[PDB]
Amino acid sequence: HPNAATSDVNVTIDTFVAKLKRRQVQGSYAIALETLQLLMRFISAARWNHVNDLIEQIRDLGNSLEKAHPTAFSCGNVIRRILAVLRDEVEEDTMSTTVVAEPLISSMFNLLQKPKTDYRQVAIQGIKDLIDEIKNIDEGIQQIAIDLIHDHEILLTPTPDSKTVLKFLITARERSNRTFTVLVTEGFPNNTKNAHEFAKKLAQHNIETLVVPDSAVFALMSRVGKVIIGTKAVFVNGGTISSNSGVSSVCECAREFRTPVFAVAGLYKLSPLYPFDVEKFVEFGGSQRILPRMDPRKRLDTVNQITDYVPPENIDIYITNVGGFNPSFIYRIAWDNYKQIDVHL
Amino acid sequence: DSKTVLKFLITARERSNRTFTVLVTEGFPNNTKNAHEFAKKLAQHNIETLVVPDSAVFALMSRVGKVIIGTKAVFVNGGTISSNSGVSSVCECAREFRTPVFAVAGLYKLSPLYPFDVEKFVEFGGSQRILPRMDPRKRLDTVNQITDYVPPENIDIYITNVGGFNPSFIYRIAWDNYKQIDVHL
Amino acid sequence: FNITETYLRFLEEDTEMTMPIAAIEALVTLLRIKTPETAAEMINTIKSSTEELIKSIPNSVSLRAGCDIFMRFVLRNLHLYGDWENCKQHLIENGQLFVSRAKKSRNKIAEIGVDFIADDDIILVHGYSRAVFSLLNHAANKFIRFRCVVTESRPSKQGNQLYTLLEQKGIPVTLIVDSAVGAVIDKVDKVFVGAEGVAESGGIINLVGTYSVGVLAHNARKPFYVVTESHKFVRMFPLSSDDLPMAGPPLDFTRRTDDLEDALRGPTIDYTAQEYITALITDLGVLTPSAVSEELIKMWYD
Amino acid sequence: FNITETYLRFLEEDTEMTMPIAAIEALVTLLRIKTPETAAEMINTIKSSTEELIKSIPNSVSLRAGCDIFMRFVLRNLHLYGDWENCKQHLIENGQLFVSRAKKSRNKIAEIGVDFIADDDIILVHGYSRAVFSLLNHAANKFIRFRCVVTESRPSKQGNQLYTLLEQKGIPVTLIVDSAVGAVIDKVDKVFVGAEGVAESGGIINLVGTYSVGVLAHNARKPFYVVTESHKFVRMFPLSSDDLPMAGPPLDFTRRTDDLEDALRGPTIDYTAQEYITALITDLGVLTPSAVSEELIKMWYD
Amino acid sequence: IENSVIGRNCQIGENIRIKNSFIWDDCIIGNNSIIDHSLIASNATLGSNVRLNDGCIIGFNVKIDDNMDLDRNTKISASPQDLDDQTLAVSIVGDKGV
Amino acid sequence: EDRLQAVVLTDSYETRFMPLTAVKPRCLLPLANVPLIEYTLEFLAKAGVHEVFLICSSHANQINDYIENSKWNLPWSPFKITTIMSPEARCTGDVMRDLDNRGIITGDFILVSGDVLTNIDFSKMLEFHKKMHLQDKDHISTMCLSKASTYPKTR
């Protein structure tokens, strides 16, 4: 399913594709915003009449988007949420049209046993809700953040690439009476400059900064107290896609040492589809960025990867804008945002 | 308690520029008085002392860097029987949280006899200083041991008059002063 | 109205229709005699039937679980509180409907669970479950990239049978013994285990060893799996390292002998914990972490 | 004259003989025929014979070790710088004497070094070794209260044999499945071993499934032990978790060829790491921590 | 196989050695064949027992059929003339063409 | 900065491919398992196109068919493909002459000879060009050159 039905209704699909491919769009937030705008455009223009057909169309669109790009997840998630929002309203409408509804609580056996129209405004409202959810993650976690780390204790911090993580760290640092030391690992071929920037910021912020070469983690692990993953995407079985490079090894080390591993992200980054593999999801960077030369470099096939995956084992807790969820619990949260038929397109 | 360990501590304290923090577990039965004496002695020179309850180790072990023991009996596979009161659980905790262990020892205090069973070598102790009067002792069953054995899975260094040795290696050291013949007679 | 006969009829059949399914069908048929409306006559009779089944059972809980599920379904049924005949009719219908559902479930599995196969990954299927085998077959049909491996299982020669079945396909086959599984740490890529019951959260009943396998996987940090269709949801939790209803005695130090009498005794049944398993495989969308427990909560409200 | 013939000679009896002791004796016998005064016509020939023996091996490991030990002994022998006759005579003598010493060592093991099973500590043993059984029998003799636990051996049905050998004493025993090894760690105390050879690295050269067992022991922190007549240090280094000089293929990947055939080739030899020996029962006094390595160093003067 | 590329709708029988290659649209890699630093173009197909070497350039409809041995840097004509080896059955080792 | 037309020299380097290029046009041949033209088009788009023009020659019917097939053909694209059809066989001077005769020539027009596909972001380059133009009236055309592995060998 490519572009064929779209005429003088929606054109921006191509622009979106372009943004995805050559990277003029940067940061997950921006992508989410773009997606929201696209959805708005869809809503204000497309022809409705029937409801099931509209739903089908939406599904098709989603499928097309998926086909176009995999590494973007926030975009997908937002769409899914909107679909879910639509679904409840649709159900309500159906219930009115038909006219027992609820026994005590939400119950199973629904998959075995047999279970003019307005919705545009509701769809619009859903988009607004999504926007609100997106607005600020840090303004919703920093109250459950200056609660874990304390005096004379030592942090270990990989991935300063996620914008949330840095902010969280800054919030933690704010206090005048409290004092703590921060270790920051690099992650060379994809995250060095960012790491340097983070270090500089820390220095500026009147805190005891420590520069770490990626090798020297082991000779300081005796003093290590906490581990924070700078993730960008979240999944079904609790797992997370990181904001690129140099996390996995550190996580493994922490696990070996049995040293606390916390996860900071957000529930807009939460996806309703399982990471069936890592190969289809995680992409590789540029082999040219490690070593120069070209003509004798046909022999020198060099390997470098951007994104990182962490198993549903090394992760422990996920404090969100709502609160502290867990790896063996996030499924329900996902369901609460994205509904049954909406997952499979 | 011993004058060796005390002397070592004094020597350590003499170079007071080194930042060392003293956490002393009381040791439920007999060790308490000895601990107090040690504390007093420390105070005599001016050394900071912090008193630790025996129940609370799990809430402290994640913070503690290095552990020093002044043991009496040293053994074959790397284990020790120390001068009484709660060591085993502490060691287990250390193993769980990964903590380095030092020991002030002597090769003359080291034994070439191997401890093979927990059922024999662990010495049970008196219930004289636990509960006053003996009428509740009819139905209840008080289980208590004074001196305890340590498994070699935990300690890693034995600082002696010669030097620091590996636990899974101390047998060689022992044999560099003792024999295989003088064991079973 | 007779269940022992039904039990006798089904033991090594399976293949076409799942063992539990047949039992469920039988239960439905039994229900559709004494009327589901008259709850005084019906529920007691159902209980009696369950008791009979238990009596006839040696080393299983799956059938019991199925009947409990059926009971739950029945309970759910009457929540329309209007016309009493339609509900009854629906109840009558849901028996062969359950059987039909199985096909659909299989189809679903053949679409969702076929995404897992990657470049050069060796697959080892544990125990006996039809669904897992079907999945494997569907993977073979897709021709991703794999290797189908069998075991030396010991109930009434199951592993051998499985191996023979695999041979039919043609895919090259090598075997793993119950003891010689220890060498497998990274070479066989992913550890798959078939299920004969799924409990609260991570609790799964199979055959003569799963817990050890799970432990091994944990040690190796290997991906561990539970693979099934849809008919096994139980409200159960054990206390010790292992606790189950048993016909074969645990640690039976056999009496003094010289000419052989009875010896083949030990832990015939095996359970698995929550921590060991990374992925749960069911047709019910894509659920993994602790969805079954939630489902149970939704159902029972007890 | 042949060492092979000598080896063939002993089959049904043995149980009393100890690996290299018989082999060593055979070697000695071979030596004391073709003039043991000279060194050019002798040592080289002995080496050649050993090589031939190695070539001829169906499935036996410790022979090489025995030969090496013999060589070492020979080397030790000629350092007195007196006369060729006396030393030669001594060499000739030292074979029967060595054999005799083995029995003494066994006796020592059975009377002094048997204080590991005394307080009804249930023993987890797999792999048929003679020393183990001697220890068992002499424990029974001393009346030193005990219970036995053995995992079922089914590559060639040695389990039955083991059971029979346990009926002679007259003490209740139980069957254990090697997949349900994770199921039972509850009442059984520690894991003890009867094996084939002692490694240069520290671990143990053993039969069908051992690594898993080791892992389980580690998980349970119930210490792992080895019971052997202590002169089976084979000149072999297991550098990895799955690489060794082996009698057969390492996890033989078989093709789908015929009907129910290429699967019974079970990996009947496996290994576990060096960080497992809490104690090893040796006849030179109870010495373990890094003892084998020390011995090796002493032998190769490095 | 070492560092070689296979194109669209190209069929492989059994037992083939390949080293450092690129292959275009619809080119059958025949039973027992070696492709080294050499290209095979659209509709041109390799049959049984062909031993190619470094830099063998192939054009349109070169039907490489049965038993051939081509040396290094050999160029083969394309369009359905100026260079040796032609479009018809078997490339030149024993003279065939018009 | 904005409104820039694309002119690409196609059907020119035939027979330079020593055996190939006679029946179907030079560019139509499948490159990396899929047609070469597409990559070039993508590159052009990235750079900044407002209308697509190619100077096709060798058997025009096939080119037309390709155009019909293509994605830039129907309304949705910001730029359409309408290839310049001229008399057979001519050099780059002659091609230029033909173009001039045809008429559609702009200020800052883009001319790429043959087919190219690379990574470097073109906006910056364009900006630099503009800056250079703003300096003096006498500024002409832009060259693209990149560094290699120290010594030359396969050149």
Numbering used by the authors:
A (entry chain C): 10 to 108, 113 to 128, 147 to 376
B (entry chain D): 192 to 376
C (entry chain B), D (entry chain A): 4 to 305
E (entry chain I): 357 to 436, 455 to 472
F (entry chain I): 24 to 178
What did the publication describing this PDB structure actually write?
For multiple rounds of initiation to occur, the GDP on eIF2 has to be exchanged for GTP. This reaction is catalysed by a guanine nucleotide exchange factor (GEF) eIF2B. Here we have determined a cryoEM structure of eIF2B in complex with the GDP-bound form of eIF2 phosphorylated at Ser51 on the α subunit, which sheds light on the molecular interactions between the two molecules and provides a basis for understanding the regulation of translation by eIF2α phosphorylation. The structure consists of two eIF2 molecules bound to opposite sides of the eIF2B hetero-decamer.
The map obtained using a linear mode dataset only did not yield a high overall resolution (5.7 Å). To further account for the different conformations of eIF2 in the complex, we also carried out focused EM data classifications using combined dataset without applying any internal symmetry and we obtained another four density maps (maps A to D in Supplementary Fig. 1), however, at lower overall resolution. To separate the different conformations adopted by eIF2 γ and β, we have applied two masked classifications. After the first masked classification, we obtained three maps A-C with conformations of eIF2γ tilted towards the PLD domains of eIF2Bγ subunit and distinct extended conformations of eIF2β. The tilted conformation of eIF2γ is stabilised by the contacts of eIF2β with the PLD domains of eIF2B γ and ε subunits and the contact of eIF2γ domain III (eIF2γ-D3) with the eIF2Bγ PLD domain (corresponding to residues 97–101 and 136–139 in eIF2Bγ PLD). This conformation results in a slight rearrangement of the three domains in eIF2γ, compared to the TC structure. Also, the eIF2γ G-domain in this conformation is more disordered than in the TC, possibly reflecting a higher mobility of this domain in this particular conformation. In all three maps, the density for eIF2β allowed modelling of the zinc-binding and central domains in the conformation similar to the one in the TC, but with the zinc-binding domain only partially covering the nucleotide-binding pocket and extended central domain approaching the binding interface between the eIF2B γ and ε PLD domains. In this position, the ε-cat domain would not have access to the nucleotide-binding pocket on the eIF2γ-G-domain.
